[PDB]
Design a protein around this nucleic acid. Structure first.
Ligand SMILES: [Cl-]
Ligand SMILES: [Cl-]
Ligand SMILES: [Cl-]
Ligand SMILES: [Cl-]
Ligand SMILES: [Cl-]
Ligand SMILES: [Cl-]
Ligand SMILES: [Cl-]
Ligand SMILES: [Mg+2]
Ligand SMILES: [Mg+2]
Ligand SMILES: [Mg+2]
Ligand SMILES: [Mg+2]
Ligand SMILES: [Mg+2]
Ligand SMILES: [Mg+2]
Ligand SMILES: [Mg+2]
Ligand SMILES: [Mg+2]
Ligand SMILES: [Mg+2]
Ligand SMILES: [Mg+2]
Ligand SMILES: [Mg+2]
Ligand SMILES: [Mg+2]
Ligand SMILES: [Mg+2]
Ligand SMILES: [Mg+2]
Ligand SMILES: [Mg+2]
Ligand SMILES: [Mg+2]
Ligand code: NA
Ligand code: NA
Ligand code: NA
Ligand code: NA
Ligand code: NA
Ligand code: NA
Ligand code: NA
Ligand code: NA
Ligand code: NA
Ligand code: NA
Ligand code: NA
Ligand code: NA
Ligand code: NA
Ligand code: NA
Ligand code: NA
Ligand code: NA
Lengths: 150, 142, 49, 142
RNA sequence: UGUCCCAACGUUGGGCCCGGUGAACUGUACAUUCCAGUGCGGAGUCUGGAGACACCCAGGGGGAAGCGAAGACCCUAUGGA
RNA sequence: CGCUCUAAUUGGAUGGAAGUAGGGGUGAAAACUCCUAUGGACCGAUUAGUGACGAAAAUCCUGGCCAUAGUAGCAGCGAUA
RNA sequence: ACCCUCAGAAGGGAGGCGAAAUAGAGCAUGAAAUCAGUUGGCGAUCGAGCGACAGGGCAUACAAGGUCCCUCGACGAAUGACCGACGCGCGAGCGUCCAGUAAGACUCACGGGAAGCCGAUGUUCUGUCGUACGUUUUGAAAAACGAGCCAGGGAGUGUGUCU
């Protein structure tokens, strides 16, 4: 698994991680990308709107065949990754919880750092025609989060 | 409170007029990188020089723009060849006994990397006292 | 006999594969293959005296 | 609108090509040039063949395109472009520091470059750019 | 008698957007190309011009002498059956 | 010039070996060497030997990995649930 | 271990052990291909063997390189004048003299200056040349053949006899 790739001052910082989550690594990049710089609280509301389908996640790199979304600003393609979103809400809930147990004001902390990493694949095999089989795998994602006082 | 290198770091060798000229030439003319053809087009191909052997190689054919081919004509002046940029001739040293016979006016010493701090300290202090500069000195806080 | 203990055969042309002996879809015997024979290995017969 | 031309060249009764060759030379030397009265510039030759050449150019084309100017305006500018490496930084810089105009929007009367002037009294086989543009179908906006 | 003149409208399942799942073919490199030329005589890459702001969605497949198969045709081998 | 192991001669290393990462110097070059970080136990030199001794290629072998792509499929069957 | 979080013997946070947890369980070291985040340089008007050699921008902790810039002056190979004087030519221009002079690459000396400053490295811009590599071939950039990328593996050996 990963380790925090960024230094964090413990006196003004709260940390959190997700380990080997089986979800879209591509969606996770997009989500991280989008919520970085946001307030843990703002992030929560955003991700919930995504899950609700009232807010699209800009898909800036893994966008092939993706249809345009009017709400995306400065870009075009976007979707509503609810699974990855839920995993991020779990990540945030933990971080904000850790932040409170330390005396900070969780929700108001800024997302200083947030990144997803593809730690592996749960390998699978799919039978195909002509007596042959081919991979059918699942990504495994790790993701770091660093909250910082404003 | 600040770092200072041990020994005669500033020491310079005394060279004949001819040698200093040849040294200055070497440094002025320089030479080509002489890296292997197309090393930059494929990662599996390293920089280490290999003679271009392809019958159609453009380098091998000496097409201008494809890089220089290694030739005797590129050799550096006999009199200076192998000299540290300072002009000193290097002498590889592993212990104190290696310092014996070294001409501090003409040669500078380079302590092998493997030698430990304990042995370095001794080599470094007796080197200085013999008027020999140490090319890779230890930096202590003074 | 190291690396020769097998009935690996090459499929020849036709499947976009190099003509390398294979068994159970695994390459074998030939020098360039992993688990294949050593081409010119040490020899008991050599007079080292 | 407003063009700090270091030079203002009057094309009236002058051989376009010759003028263009000089305006390019200067534009590459860093001069800002403005060519005036383009419509009155001239090109020697048998009108009929001269026109076929330009009419062909207009007809040439396809999806990728071959945009050929019809106004004496463009005609003259394209001619200058052909004398500059307009795709290189330096060349596009020069080309862009050059502008051709119908009539003269300046107060000063442009100068006449040496060896570009045509003697109507001793020349009958030649044509006006404006004449060519009219034939091409341009809109006589002059 | 929609085979045709000569196509139209409609029905169901796809196709398109969204959540979830999630391969393969293929990849020397570079690559926004077009017209001409040239070259081992069938060039996105040479030469000359022309055109060309970047990214993305959908399409029908013109080109990559597209992808797939060390040509079955033909000839050659002091080859095989 | 470089690699393995043997021998003689002779050195380095827990006051930090090999290796690896980045960086400085030398050699026309094969390649040699130093600095910092990592590492945490082995490593050289000269001479004379040794040989399963040097790779960009073989539709090469084995493993890992990127693009392909959040794409195809998860609709089509007289059993539409 | 204990405490917080969590649907939770999961995971995470905080904490404890040890020289070391970046030794935390397929756990020594931890390359490349390659992925996330990020720094430097370039960047939505522009052209493709991706570079070599020259030269500029921007960027750079120490270490292991320490040079570099401008005035002037010394030396100074081949080469080698302007102006002016005189004499030719229809003319472009030439001849003689001034003069093998002034100049002239490198190098050096005095004085002054730079420490991102010189070298070097990263990237990018300009100039010159430039259609991979290997193989087949009279001729390969080839619309001839091979490779997706990287690592590791991958081909003159032994005995006998002869020379
Ligand atoms: Cl993925
Ligand atoms: Cl030599
Ligand atoms: Cl057109
Ligand atoms: Cl150009
Ligand atoms: Cl006339
Ligand atoms: Cl010199
Ligand atoms: Cl051989
Ligand atoms: Mg789509
Ligand atoms: Mg079957
Ligand atoms: Mg390389
Ligand atoms: Mg074996
Ligand atoms: Mg064949
Ligand atoms: Mg037959
Ligand atoms: Mg037969
Ligand atoms: Mg010895
Ligand atoms: Mg080869
Ligand atoms: Mg493979
Ligand atoms: Mg597709
Ligand atoms: Mg029904
Ligand atoms: Mg480990
Ligand atoms: Mg072109
Ligand atoms: Mg032929
Ligand atoms: Mg190898
Ligand atoms: Na994209
Ligand atoms: Na938008
Ligand atoms: Na918008
Ligand atoms: Na067996
Ligand atoms: Na293959
Ligand atoms: Na024997
Ligand atoms: Na003319
Ligand atoms: Na046209
Ligand atoms: Na019908
Ligand atoms: Na097509
Ligand atoms: Na540079
Ligand atoms: Na071949
Ligand atoms: Na070739
Ligand atoms: Na060809
Ligand atoms: Na593949
Ligand atoms: Na071998």
């Amino acid at each position: 698994g990963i380790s925090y790739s960024v230094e964090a001052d413990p006196d003004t910082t709260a940390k959190a991680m997700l380990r080997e989550r089986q979800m879209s690594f591509k969606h996770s990049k997009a989500i991280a990308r989008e919520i970085k710089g946001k307030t843990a609280g703002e992030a929560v509301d955003y991700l919930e709107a995504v899950i609700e389908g009232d807010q699209p996640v800009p898909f800036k790199q893994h966008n092939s065949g993706v249809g345009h979304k009017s709400k995306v600003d400065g870009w075009d393609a976007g979707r509503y990754p609810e699974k990855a979103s839920k995993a991020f809400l779990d990540l945030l809930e933990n971080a904000v919880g850790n932040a409170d147990h330390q005396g900070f004001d969780g929700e108001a902390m800024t997302i200083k750092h947030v990144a997803a990493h593809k730690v592996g694949e749960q390998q699978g095999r799919k039978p195909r025609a002509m007596g042959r089989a081919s991979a059918w795998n699942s990504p495994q994602v790790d993701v770091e989060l660093i909250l910082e006082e404003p | 409170t600040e770092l200072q290198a041990r020994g005669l770091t500033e020491k310079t060798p005394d060279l004949s007029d001819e040698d200093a000229r040849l040294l200055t030439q070497r440094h002025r003319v320089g030479k080509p990188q002489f890296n292997r053809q197309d090393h930059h087009k494929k990662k599996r191909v390293s920089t280490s020089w290999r003679k271009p052997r392809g019958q159609l190689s453009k380098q091998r054919r000496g097409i201008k723009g494809k890089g220089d081919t290694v030739e005797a004509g590129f050799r550096s002046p006999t009199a200076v060849r192998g000299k540290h940029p300072s002009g000193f001739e290097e002498v590889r040293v592993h212990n104190v006994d290696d310092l014996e016979g070294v001409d501090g006016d003409t040669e500078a010493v380079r302590i092998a990397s493997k030698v430990g701090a304990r042995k370095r300290e001794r080599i470094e202090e007796e080197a200085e006292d013999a008027g020999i500069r140490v090319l890779n000195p230890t930096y202590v806080e003074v | 006999y190291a690396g020769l203990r097998t009935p690996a055969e090459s499929f020849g042309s036709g499947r976009g594969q190099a003509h390398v002996p294979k068994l159970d879809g695994r390459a074998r015997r030939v020098p360039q293959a992993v688990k294949g024979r050593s081409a010119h290995p040490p020899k008991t017969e050599k007079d080292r005296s | 609108a407003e063009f700090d031309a270091d030079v203002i060249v009057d094309a009236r009764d002058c051989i376009m090509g010759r003028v263009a060759s000089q305006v390019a030379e200067q534009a590459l030397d860093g001069e800002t040039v403005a060519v005036v009265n383009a419509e009155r510039a001239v090109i020697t030759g048998r009108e009929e063949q001269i026109v076929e050449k330009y009419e062909k150019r207009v007809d040439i084309g396809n999806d990728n395109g071959y945009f050929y100017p019809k106004r004496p305006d463009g005609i003259f500018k394209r001619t200058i472009r052909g004398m500059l490496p307009h795709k290189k930084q330096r060349g596009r810089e020069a080309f862009e520091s050059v502008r051709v105009y119908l009539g003269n929007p300046y107060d000063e009367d442009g100068e006449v470059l040496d060896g570009t002037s045509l003697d109507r009294l001793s020349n009958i086989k030649f044509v006006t750019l404006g004449e060519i543009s009219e034939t091409l179908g341009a809109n006589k906006t002059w």
